[PDB]
């Protein structure tokens, strides 16, 4: 018996929005310490990783480990029905063929009950962790979003360069080139605008803009994005739920 009751229906809606455009069919391994999910895109370049997060629910009852294979398009359609704001509780039995999504309003009866047929994958359960990153940074997610959207007009490839006290995003194409340079700072009165950098060694990586445009959709989840980069490892892009996370693992362009 699963009873994942969210405080806010938009919260689950916002989570799923960060996935839907890169991955379609995905298993949601419910445990008793929350819900873990993981999926790879078709090109085998981007891995999405989710972790909620008992404290991100109002309540979370889950008697026994349960896997919910869901088509995210179908799930979206149901998550558009969230009369914002409304409490959303996910109900599913121990051996489920469907998932009940219940929307309740504070003043009721104004109850909405949706049912969604499950699909079975047939996945990896690929829990592999964790690497040594050359540099790790955090900046406002909306800032990182604009940077990616802007540079994407210039090229199919975006370069990320970390030197001493410098984070540099570069794009180069037919039109011409573009460079965004940001330096670490803290504003004590507005710590959420801060740019933080930790460097063990410099990094020169080049990424598919196609994938980064998808990654920055996690912007709705957190006002900050964490970025960890290695010379010979996939990049990690992370938006923090409070608490839990949404993670993206990207393969860079080599040779």
């Amino acid at each position: 018996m699963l009873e994942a009751k969210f405080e806010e229906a938009s919260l689950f809606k916002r989570i799923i929005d960060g996935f839907k455009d890169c991955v379609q069919l995905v298993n949601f391994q419910c445990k008793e310490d929350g819900i873990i999910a993981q999926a790879v895109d078709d090109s085998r370049v981007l891995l999405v990783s989710l972790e909620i997060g008992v404290e991100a629910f109002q309540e979370y009852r889950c008697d026994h480990p349960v896997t919910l294979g869901m088509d995210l398009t179908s799930l979206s359609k149901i998550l558009r029905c969230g009369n914002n704001t409304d409490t959303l509780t996910l109900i599913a039995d121990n051996t489920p063929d469907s998932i009940i999504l219940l929307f309740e309003d504070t003043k009721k009866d104004r109850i909405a009950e949706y049912s969604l047929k499950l699909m079975d994958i047939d996945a990896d359960f690929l829990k592999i962790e964790e690497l040594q990153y050359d540099s790790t940074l955090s900046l406002p997610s909306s800032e990182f979003s604009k940077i990616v959207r802007d540079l994407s007009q210039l090229s199919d490839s975006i370069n990320i360069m970390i030197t001493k006290e410098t984070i540099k995003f570069v794009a180069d194409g037919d039109i011409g080139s573009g460079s965004v340079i940001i330096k670490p700072f803290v504003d004590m009165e507005h710590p959420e605008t801060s740019i933080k950098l930790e460097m063990d060694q410099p990094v020169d990586l080049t990424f598919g803009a196609k994938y980064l445009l998808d990654i920055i959709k996690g912007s709705s989840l957190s006002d900050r994005v964490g970025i960890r980069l290695s010379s010979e490892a996939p990049a990690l892009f992370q938006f923090d739920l409070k608490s839990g996370f949404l993670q993206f693992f990207l393969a860079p362009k080599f040779n």
Partner: peptide, 11 residues
């Protein structure tokens, strides 16, 4: 321009 690698190189 570098060519796109997959995530197979790391599993």
């Amino acid at each position: 321009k570098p060519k796109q690698a997959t995530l197979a190189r790391f599993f």
